[PDB]
Design a protein around this ligand. Structure first.
Ligand SMILES: [Mg+2]
Ligand SMILES: [Mg+2]
Ligand SMILES: [Mg+2]
Ligand SMILES: [Mg+2]
Ligand SMILES: [Mg+2]
Ligand SMILES: [Mg+2]
Ligand SMILES: [Mg+2]
Ligand SMILES: [Mg+2]
Ligand SMILES: [Mg+2]
Ligand SMILES: [Mg+2]
Ligand SMILES: [Mg+2]
Ligand SMILES: [Mg+2]
Ligand SMILES: [Mg+2]
Ligand SMILES: [Mg+2]
Ligand SMILES: [Mg+2]
Ligand SMILES: [Mg+2]
Ligand SMILES: [Mg+2]
Ligand SMILES: [Mg+2]
Ligand SMILES: [Mg+2]
Ligand SMILES: [Mg+2]
Ligand SMILES: [Mg+2]
Ligand SMILES: [Mg+2]
Ligand SMILES: [Mg+2]
Ligand SMILES: [Mg+2]
Ligand SMILES: [Mg+2]
Ligand SMILES: [Mg+2]
Ligand SMILES: [Mg+2]
Ligand SMILES: [Mg+2]
Ligand SMILES: [Mg+2]
Ligand SMILES: [Mg+2]
Ligand SMILES: [Mg+2]
Ligand SMILES: [Mg+2]
Ligand SMILES: [Mg+2]
Ligand SMILES: [Mg+2]
Ligand SMILES: [Mg+2]
Ligand SMILES: [Mg+2]
Ligand SMILES: [Mg+2]
Ligand SMILES: [Mg+2]
Ligand SMILES: [Mg+2]
Ligand SMILES: [Mg+2]
Ligand SMILES: [Mg+2]
Ligand SMILES: [Mg+2]
Ligand SMILES: [Mg+2]
Ligand SMILES: [Mg+2]
Ligand SMILES: [Mg+2]
Ligand SMILES: [Mg+2]
Ligand SMILES: [Mg+2]
Ligand SMILES: [Mg+2]
Ligand SMILES: [Mg+2]
Ligand SMILES: [Mg+2]
Ligand SMILES: [Mg+2]
Ligand SMILES: [Mg+2]
Ligand SMILES: [Mg+2]
Ligand SMILES: [Mg+2]
Ligand SMILES: [Mg+2]
Ligand SMILES: [Mg+2]
Ligand SMILES: [Mg+2]
Ligand SMILES: [Mg+2]
Ligand SMILES: [Mg+2]
Ligand SMILES: [Mg+2]
Ligand SMILES: [Mg+2]
Ligand SMILES: [Mg+2]
Ligand SMILES: [Mg+2]
Ligand SMILES: [Mg+2]
Ligand SMILES: [Mg+2]
Ligand SMILES: [Mg+2]
Ligand SMILES: [Mg+2]
Ligand SMILES: [Mg+2]
Ligand SMILES: [Mg+2]
Ligand SMILES: [Mg+2]
Ligand SMILES: [Mg+2]
Ligand SMILES: [Mg+2]
Ligand SMILES: [Mg+2]
Ligand SMILES: [Mg+2]
Ligand SMILES: [Mg+2]
Ligand SMILES: [Mg+2]
Ligand SMILES: [Mg+2]
Ligand SMILES: [Mg+2]
Ligand SMILES: [Mg+2]
Ligand SMILES: [Mg+2]
Ligand SMILES: [Mg+2]
Ligand SMILES: [Mg+2]
Ligand SMILES: [Mg+2]
Ligand SMILES: [Mg+2]
Ligand SMILES: [Mg+2]
Ligand SMILES: [Mg+2]
Ligand SMILES: [Mg+2]
Ligand SMILES: [Mg+2]
Ligand SMILES: [Mg+2]
Ligand SMILES: [Mg+2]
Ligand SMILES: [Mg+2]
Ligand SMILES: [Mg+2]
Ligand SMILES: [Mg+2]
Lengths: 203, 51, 148, 99, 193
RNA sequence: UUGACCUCAAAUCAGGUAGGAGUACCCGCUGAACUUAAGCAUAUCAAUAAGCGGAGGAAAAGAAACCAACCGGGAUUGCCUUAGUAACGGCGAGUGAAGCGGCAAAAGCUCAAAUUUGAAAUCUGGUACCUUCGGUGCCCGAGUUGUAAUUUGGAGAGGGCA
RNA sequence: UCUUUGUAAAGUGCCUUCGAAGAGUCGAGUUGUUUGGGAAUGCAGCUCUAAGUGGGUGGUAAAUUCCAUCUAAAGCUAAAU
RNA sequence: CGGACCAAGGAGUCUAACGUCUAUGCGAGUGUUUGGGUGUAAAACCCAUACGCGUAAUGAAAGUGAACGUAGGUUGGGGCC
RNA sequence: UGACAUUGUGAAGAGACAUAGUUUCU
C-alpha cells in the first residue's frame, strides 16, 4: 500500500526532495489566512493514522501560530512582587503550539469537534498545522459506531481541556514513577494529598 | 470536625455490658433503678418461650 | 470536658492565669522552630543534640521491604509451636522425629540467640541465622536449614 | 538461571520447578520484516543522503570512525545512535563506490 | 517557640487546611448504599455470583512471597490448559489476564486445578429459554477459597551433615562480593601473552 | 466550439450546529502578595486567592513504552497503610511522595499500517411506498489522493490437512 | 407467539510460509517553570534530530559487557470517587 | 489612662500530632468501627485478611547481633523465715 | 553585540584528504 512509502519518505526531512517541497508549500501557506479550510490531507498517510477517514463529516484545517515564548504581558515588564517572580522574558508557556493551533480552529467551527492534529511545516515566524475534525451531527458520523463516541456531550471542545493527544501530553498523563506528580491529574492528585480525612472513630 | 463519636476498647465494652447483665439480677439495684418489682416472682424473672 | 477546664476557675481574675507583667501576647519566641541556632540554642543542645546538619549517605528511592527481616531469638522460637503439640515434642527430644519450625512461614527473617532453649532437637527452617543462633540449636540436637 | 535456594549469594532464590512460557510478540516489535526492508531501501535511493550525513561519510573517508562517531554523537543525540549511524555510512560506502 | 523537653513535632498546617477536611459523616450512610447496591447487583445478576473467578498467585517482593494470594486472571495458558478458550471463560465467571505469565509450574498446576474445580461446581444455563431457576451462590471466592501451600511435615529426622549454614551464608555473600574482581584477575591472567 | 478536473467564491440557496447562563464538584491556562522565617532576598504561604478558557451528572483516569528485582506482580479510580517516611531544603524555617500489603468497585478493548481486485463489497442527501428513533426501490451526490469486510501484538494473516 | 435469517456467520487441532505495529516524533543541548526526584520529576520554548535483533524504563553523571521489563510518539470504555 | 447612666450581647476555643500524670481494659502483645457481617437502622451486636505501635540493638553503610556464671560479685534494702 | 534557525542561486578569490573538487568563508 502506497501509505507506508509516504510514512517513510516523510521521515527524511533533510532529504532534497522534501525540502524543495517543504519550502514551496510553506510559502503557499503564509499567503493564505492564519486559519483556512484545507481541501484534503496534504499528508494523507498522517491523517489516516491519526483517526481520519475520507467520507462526508470529516474535516481538515490549516492554522498558523507564531513561534517562541510567552512574553509575560505586565505593563513595562513591571512585576510588583518578589525577585523570583520578576521575570518577563524567558518564560515558555505550559501548552504546546499544537494545542494553540487546535484551540483556535476548534473555536472557528464550534459545530465541528477536534479529533486530532498534526504538524506540517514551519519557518521562524510560524509553525503550521493541519487539524482533523469531525462534525458530530453529520449522520454518516452519527451512525458509524467507531467514531460516534465523539458525538457525546462529554467530548465538547475536548481540545480546551487537553484531551486531544497533544493536551494529554502537556498534561503529563502517563503511567509510572516518572509521572507521579501529574497523572491522575495534577490538581486532583494534589488536592487528594492535601485533605484531612477524619473518621468518626478517629484513627 | 469536632470529635463526636468515641472509641471504647471492644473488650471494655463487653466487660461493661457483662456487668450490666449481672446487675439485672440483684433485686436491690433494679428497685434502685426505678422499676416497681417488689411484686415479681423471682429474679432473674424467666418467662416461657411461648412469649 | 469544659467544666473541669481550668479556664472556668479563672473567670473573674483579670489576667486568666497569664501574669499582669508578661501578658499572653502573640508569639514571643517567634513562631515554630524559629531561632533554632539563635535565641533557642540552649533548648536544642540538650533535649535535642544532634539536631543540626548532616550525617551519612543519601539513598534515593529506598523501598523499605528490601530490608524486611523480623528478628526472633532462640529466647522464644519454641513458641512458634502450638502449646498442645509443643510438650508432645519437648519430651521425646529425638532425631528420627524432631519438630520442623518454618520461621519464614511464621514471619521472621533472622534467628538471633537471646538465650537458652532446652536440650530438645528442633529443625529450624530460617532465612538467616546468627552464629550463636545456629550454634545453640546444634548443642540441643537441632539443625538450621537455609530457605527462601 | 536456577536459584540456589538461600536468601543471599549469587543465584539467591527459592527453588521452584520452572516452565519458560510461550514467547510474546509484543517482543518482536522492532523486528525487521521484508516489507519494511524493501520500502526503507527503495526510499533511500529515492531521497538520497542528507546534509548532516553527506558531511558524515566524507568525514569517514578523511578521518575515520572515531572523529566520525564524536561528530555523530553530538549531531544525533547519543553515542549509541552515533555508533549505529557511522555503521550505516560505512555500509553506504562499501556496497557502493566499491563493489 | 521552642521550650521544654519535648519531641520535635511536625504538624503540616500552614495551608488553608480547614478548606480540605473530610469528615466521614456519611460512613454509615455509605455502608448502607453499598449493601443496598450489592443486593441490586445480586438480583440484576440473575443466578450469577457477583464476582469472577480469580487465580492463585504468589505475591511479589521478598516480603510477601511466603504468602500466596488471589491474583487478577488466569493466563492464556491455564485457560487453554484447562480446556476452554479465553474469550469464553470470561462469560463463565472466570477472569482471564492476558498479561500474567507462567513461570512457576506449581502455581500453574494449581490454577488449572482451580479451573477444573470451578467448572465442575457450576452449571451453564442454555441459550434457549428454559432458565431452570437455580439459586445464586453469591461469592465464588468463598466457594473456591485460596489456601497457603503446605511445605512440609511437623517432624522429621535431624540431618546434620555439618556446614554451619551461618558460614554458608557469608561464604555465598562473599562469592558474590568478589565475583567481579575474581573475574578481572581471570581476564588479566588470560592476557598473559 | 463544447465537456471535465483542481482550487477558490456567491446565494434570504436545503437541512443543521456554536454563542449566553450556571459553575458545589470536574479538565486546563494563568498567577499574587499578605504570612512564616522572630531581620530578609532563596524558601515559604501556594504549584493557594483573584483573572481566562472548557465539560458532565459526575469529570478525569483507564487495559501498561506500568510495577518491579519477587517463588515475581498485572488498566484505571478511592479508602486503610506505606509516612510525617525516601527525598527536597539560606539541609534553616520548613517541605515531602512511591512500590509492596488489606479493602471498595471491577470489564474490557479499536484504529493506523494488508490487493475486494472475478468486480466500492461503503456512504450523505433528494424522492415514492411502508409496518417511520427506522426499512425498501430509484436518482443526484461522496468516495480509489481509499468508503466496507478481514487484522490490533494477548496477536494475527496467506497456503495445505482433519 | 410470528418470521428462519443460510447455499450465512463464528469457535477449536496439525503442517507450512509470513508476521506489515504511529517522525520535527523518540532522543540530545540549552533556557524557563515545576517536583520529594537529589549530574536534573513533569511541562514548554529554540537548535539538533534518530532507529528496526529497534525503542522506552530500570530514582548518581560516564565508557564497556550483560540482565530485567514493558511496547511510546493515534483511539474508546461502566462501577467503586 | 478607660469609665455620664441602664439593659442585652462580649474574651484561652475546636482540631492534628505530642510530654508528664492518672483511671480503665487486656498483656508479650495490643488496636472490633478502611471494610464485611448484621440491625428494632448514622445506634447496638459481630468479624476474616492485613496494618500500626510494642516484643533488638548498633553502625554513614556493607553488616553483625545479647547467659563464663543458680543471668555474676560487693554494699544498703521492706517483707518473710 | 555575537551564534544558530528563517536562508536560496551564480562568479572570482582564499582554505583541507596532502596541487583532481564534495565542503567552508571574504
Ligand atoms: Mg532519517
Ligand atoms: Mg469534499
Ligand atoms: Mg510588591
Ligand atoms: Mg505580582
Ligand atoms: Mg519567516
Ligand atoms: Mg508532590
Ligand atoms: Mg491540575
Ligand atoms: Mg487534577
Ligand atoms: Mg470511624
Ligand atoms: Mg483522640
Ligand atoms: Mg462539660
Ligand atoms: Mg466547676
Ligand atoms: Mg481541652
Ligand atoms: Mg484559681
Ligand atoms: Mg473565681
Ligand atoms: Mg498559667
Ligand atoms: Mg505579674
Ligand atoms: Mg493585662
Ligand atoms: Mg513589673
Ligand atoms: Mg537560648
Ligand atoms: Mg533538620
Ligand atoms: Mg549523599
Ligand atoms: Mg545508599
Ligand atoms: Mg540494619
Ligand atoms: Mg526477647
Ligand atoms: Mg552471634
Ligand atoms: Mg527548660
Ligand atoms: Mg496535613
Ligand atoms: Mg502561615
Ligand atoms: Mg460530603
Ligand atoms: Mg452514603
Ligand atoms: Mg465484588
Ligand atoms: Mg509465583
Ligand atoms: Mg508482594
Ligand atoms: Mg427465555
Ligand atoms: Mg437557508
Ligand atoms: Mg460558555
Ligand atoms: Mg472555570
Ligand atoms: Mg503561583
Ligand atoms: Mg494569613
Ligand atoms: Mg517575616
Ligand atoms: Mg515578627
Ligand atoms: Mg518586613
Ligand atoms: Mg520568595
Ligand atoms: Mg515554588
Ligand atoms: Mg489552599
Ligand atoms: Mg481561581
Ligand atoms: Mg447539564
Ligand atoms: Mg454518562
Ligand atoms: Mg456513581
Ligand atoms: Mg495494549
Ligand atoms: Mg513481569
Ligand atoms: Mg494496578
Ligand atoms: Mg523526613
Ligand atoms: Mg519558614
Ligand atoms: Mg511552610
Ligand atoms: Mg525537620
Ligand atoms: Mg509545595
Ligand atoms: Mg505533605
Ligand atoms: Mg491488594
Ligand atoms: Mg467494553
Ligand atoms: Mg476470522
Ligand atoms: Mg479496517
Ligand atoms: Mg504504538
Ligand atoms: Mg545550544
Ligand atoms: Mg507558571
Ligand atoms: Mg542525577
Ligand atoms: Mg528540569
Ligand atoms: Mg547509561
Ligand atoms: Mg531493552
Ligand atoms: Mg477511533
Ligand atoms: Mg478517555
Ligand atoms: Mg496608656
Ligand atoms: Mg474620660
Ligand atoms: Mg450580660
Ligand atoms: Mg471578647
Ligand atoms: Mg497532668
Ligand atoms: Mg490498667
Ligand atoms: Mg509477640
Ligand atoms: Mg459501630
Ligand atoms: Mg441508616
Ligand atoms: Mg451477630
Ligand atoms: Mg477474609
Ligand atoms: Mg499485630
Ligand atoms: Mg523503640
Ligand atoms: Mg546492639
Ligand atoms: Mg562507624
Ligand atoms: Mg563483612
Ligand atoms: Mg568470656
Ligand atoms: Mg567467650
Ligand atoms: Mg568486691
Ligand atoms: Mg552578524
Ligand atoms: Mg533558490
Amino acid at each position: 500500500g502506497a501509505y507506508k512509502y509516504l510514512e517513510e519518505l516523510q521521515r527524511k526531512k533533510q532529504s532534497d526532495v522534501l525540502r524543495f517541497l517543504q519550502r514551496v508549500r510553506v510559502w503557499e501557506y503564509r499567503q493564505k489566512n492564519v486559519i483556512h479550510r484545507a481541501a484534503r490531507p496534504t499528508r494523507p498517510d498522517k491523517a489516516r493514522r491519526l483517526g481520519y477517514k475520507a467520507k462526508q463529516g470529516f474535516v481538515i484545517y490549516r492554522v498558523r501560530v507564531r513561534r517562541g515564548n510567552r512574553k509575560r504581558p505586565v505593563p513595562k515588564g513591571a512585576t510588583y512582587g518578589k525577585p523570583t517572580n520578576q521575570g518577563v522574558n524567558e518564560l515558555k508557556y505550559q501548552r504546546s503550539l499544537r494545542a494553540t493551533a487546535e484551540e483556535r480552529v476548534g473555536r472557528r467551527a464550534a459545530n465541528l469537534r477536534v479529533l486530532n492534529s498534526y504538524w506540517v511545516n514551519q519557518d521562524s515566524t510560524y509553525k503550521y498545522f493541519e487539524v482533523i475534525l469531525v462534525d458530530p451531527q453529520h449522520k454518516a458520523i452519527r451512525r458509524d459506531a467507531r467514531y460516534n463516541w465523539i458525538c457525546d456531550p462529554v467530548h465538547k471542545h475536548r481540545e480546551a481541556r487537553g484531551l486531544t493527544a497533544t493536551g494529554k501530553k502537556s498534561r503529563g498523563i502517563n503511567k509510572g514513577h516518572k509521572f507521579n506528580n501529574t497523572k491522575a491529574g495534577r490538581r486532583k492528585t494534589w488536592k487528594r494529598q492535601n485533605t484531612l480525612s477524619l473518621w468518626r472513630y478517629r484513627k | 470536625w469536632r470529635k463526636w463519636n468515641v472509641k471504647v476498647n471492644h473488650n471494655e465494652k463487653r466487660y461493661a455490658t457483662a456487668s450490666a447483665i449481672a446487675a439485672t439480677a440483684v433485686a436491690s439495684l433494679v428497685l434502685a433503678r426505678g422499676h416497681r418489682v417488689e411484686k415479681i416472682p423471682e429474679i432473674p424473672l424467666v418467662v416461657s418461650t411461648d412469649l | 470536658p469544659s467544666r473541669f477546664t481550668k479556664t472556668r476557675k479563672h473567670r473573674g481574675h483579670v489576667s486568666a492565669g497569664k501574669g499582669r507583667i508578661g501578658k499572653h501576647r502573640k508569639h514571643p519566641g517567634g513562631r515554630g522552630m524559629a531561632g533554632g541556632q539563635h535565641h533557642h540554642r540552649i533548648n536544642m543542645d540538650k533535649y535535642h543534640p544532634g539536631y543540626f546538619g548532616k550525617v551519612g549517605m543519601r539513598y534515593f528511592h529506598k523501598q523499605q521491604a528490601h530490608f524486611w527481616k523480623p528478628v526472633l531469638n532462640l529466647d522464644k522460637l519454641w513458641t512458634l509451636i502450638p502449646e498442645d503439640k509443643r510438650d508432645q515434642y519437648l519430651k521425646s527430644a529425638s532425631k528420627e522425629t524432631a519438630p520442623v519450625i518454618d520461621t519464614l512461614a511464621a514471619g521472621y527473617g533472622k534467628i538471633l540467640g537471646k538465650g537458652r532453649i532446652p536440650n530438645v532437637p528442633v529443625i529450624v527452617k530460617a532465612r538467616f541465622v546468627s552464629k550463636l543462633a545456629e550454634e545453640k540449636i546444634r548443642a540441643a540436637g537441632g539443625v538450621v536449614e537455609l530457605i527462601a | 538461571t536456577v536459584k540456589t535456594g538461600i536468601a543471599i549469594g549469587l543465584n539467591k532464590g527459592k527453588k521452584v520447578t520452572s516452565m519458560t512460557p510461550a514467547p510474546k510478540i509484543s517482543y518482536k516489535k522492532g523486528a525487521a520484516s521484508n516489507r519494511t526492508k524493501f520500502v526503507r531501501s527503495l526510499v533511500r535511493e529515492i531521497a538520497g543522503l542528507s546534509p548532516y550525513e553527506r558531511r558524515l561519510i566524507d568525514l569517514i573517508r578523511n578521518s575515520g570512525e572515531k572523529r566520525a562517531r564524536k561528530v555523530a554523537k553530538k549531531r544525533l543525540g547519543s553515542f549509541t545512535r552515533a555508533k549505529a549511524k557511522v555503521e550505516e555510512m560505512n555500509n553506504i560506502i562499501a556496497a557502493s563506490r566499491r563493489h | 517557640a521552642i521550650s521544654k523537653n519535648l519531641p520535635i513535632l511536625k504538624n503540616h498546617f500552614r495551608k488553608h487546611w480547614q478548606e480540605r477536611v473530610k469528615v466521614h459523616f456519611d460512613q454509615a450512610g455509605k455502608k448502607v448504599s453499598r449493601r443496598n447496591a450489592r443486593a441490586t447487583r445480586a438480583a440484576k445478576i440473575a443466578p450469577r455470583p457477583l464476582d469472577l473467578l480469580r487465580p492463585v498467585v504468589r505475591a511479589p517482593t521478598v516480603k510477601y512471597n511466603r504468602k500466596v494470594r488471589a491474583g487478577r486472571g488466569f493466563t492464556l495458558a491455564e485457560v487453554k490448559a484447562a480446556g476452554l478458550t479465553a474469550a469464553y471463560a470470561r462469560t463463565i465467571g472466570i477472569a482471564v489476564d492476558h498479561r500474567r505469565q507462567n513461570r512457576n509450574q506449581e502455581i500453574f498446576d494449581a490454577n488449572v486445578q482451580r479451573l477444573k474445580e470451578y467448572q465442575s461446581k457450576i452449571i451453564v444455563f442454555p441459550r434457549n429459554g428454559k432458565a431452570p431457576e437455580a439459586e445464586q451462590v453469591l461469592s465464588a471466592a468463598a466457594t473456591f477459597p485460596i489456601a497457603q501451600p503446605a511445605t512440609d511435615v511437623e517432624a522429621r529426622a535431624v540431618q546434620d551433615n555439618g556446614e554451619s549454614a551461618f558460614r554458608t551464608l557469608r561464604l555465598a555473600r562473599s562469592e558474590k562480593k568478589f565475583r567481579g574482581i575474581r573475574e578481572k584477575r581471570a581476564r588479566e591472567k588470560a592476557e598473559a601473552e
